[PDB]
Amino acid sequence: APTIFSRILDKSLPADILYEDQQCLVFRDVAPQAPVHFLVIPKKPIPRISQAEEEDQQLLGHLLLVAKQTAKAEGLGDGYRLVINDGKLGAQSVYHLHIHVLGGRQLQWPPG
Amino acid sequence: APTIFSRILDKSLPADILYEDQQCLVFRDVAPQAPVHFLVIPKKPIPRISQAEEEDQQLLGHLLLVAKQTAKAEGLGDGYRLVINDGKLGAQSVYHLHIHVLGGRQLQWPPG
Ligand SMILES: Nc1nc2c(ncn2[C@H]2C[C@H](O)[C@@H](COP(=O)(O)O)O2)c(=O)[nH]1
Ligand SMILES: Nc1nc2c(ncn2[C@H]2C[C@H](O)[C@@H](COP(=O)(O)O)O2)c(=O)[nH]1
Incomplete structure (x- = not known):
């Protein structure tokens, strides 16, 4: 059930938020492996990518679209x-x- | 226009095919970086992930779903x-x- 990302979602745990909609959250990584390192997480709390189903199809593509548009906003054109x-x-x-x-x-x- | 993946798609270039549907192709990498290394490519020839649009939403999620079910078939449960x-x-x-x-x-x- 609860994960670290439960605490970032419900806002009890301080996080750097770049974007939020009804389907997902977008926040920076506390252990950045690159000058820009952020995480695109859904709100439906799917544990792993291998535990996703056909009902999550539209939601996974949305997470990808959110990631690339958030890549643009943070000036990753190179x-x-x-x-x-x-x-x-x-x-x-x-x-x-x-x-x-x-x-x-x-x-x-x-x-x- | 044409890429290497044009030649794998149209079948003129020999490739190891694990899956095919009307939306995408799934084939092994010729330069494998892991015991199992395959590529999940769409048929609509979108150049980059940053050049994808809202019309590709359902298609991107499908590419992700195809990838994880192909991960299972090849026995990647660990x-x-x-x-x-x-x-x-x-x-x-x-x-x-x-x-x-x-x-x-x-x-x-x-x-x-
Ligand atoms: N921003 C933030 N990121 C965290 C926190 N705890 C863990 N993370 C990040 C670090 C990792 O890069 C990521 C988990 O990646 P993975 O190993 O693929 O599940 O989550 C936290 O409290 N804040
Ligand atoms: N199977 C196969 N893979 C190829 C061929 N040419 C290139 N590739 C693979 C090697 C790379 O891992 C991948 C391209 O990755 P990227 O650098 O992200 O565009 O495509 C080929 O002729 N056959």
């Missing part, structure tokens, strides 16, 4: 990287579905 | 990572929208 980690081999820590958005520096390959 | 690179700071090479899917080994942090 490029950025979106990352969704699953389970332990994915190195997932918070078990609320979120899209990482990283830019303002050159991301390398492999991506971990 | 975890995996999805990656969408944009522009040059993203280190994008093919300018057709695609979701990288990597697993079957432990992905590290940062993701590049």
Whole structure:
């Protein structure tokens, strides 16, 4: 049930909010891996990306659209990287579905 | 206009195909960065994730759903990572929208 992102959502836990709508939240990462590192999280509290269903189709695309328009607002026109980690081999820590958005520096390959 | 993925789509260029529907293609990466590394590409030839529009909403979520169900089929229950690179700071090479899917080994942090 409750995660760290429960506390960011309900506002009890201080977070840097860049965007909010009825479907999702967008806030900065407290451990930034790039000059701009923010998280695009839904409001329906889907734990992992592998635990998503057809009912979440329109919502996942929306999370992607929100991420790229938030990438623009923060002046990432020279490029950025979106990352969704699953389970332990994915190195997932918070078990609320979120899209990482990283830019303002050159991301390398492999991506971990 | 034409990209490498034009040649994989129209089938002139040999590719390892794991899935195909009317909306997208799913094929292995020729330069695998993990024991399982495949690409989830749409059929509507959107160049970058930052050049996507509201009309592509349902299609982006579908690409994500296809990626996670293809993650299951290839036995990634211990975890995996999805990656969408944009522009040059993203280190994008093919300018057709695609979701990288990597697993079957432990992905590290940062993701590049
Ligand atoms: N802004 C903020 N981010 C957090 C907090 N706790 C964890 N995070 C971030 C750090 C990670 O980059 C991210 C979880 O990523 P993942 O390992 O994919 O679940 O959430 C917090 O209190 N504030
Ligand atoms: N399977 C296959 N993959 C290719 C070929 N050419 C390029 N790729 C892959 C390698 C990269 O991992 C990916 C492009 O990633 P990106 O840099 O994000 O655009 O496409 C090919 O001929 N066959």
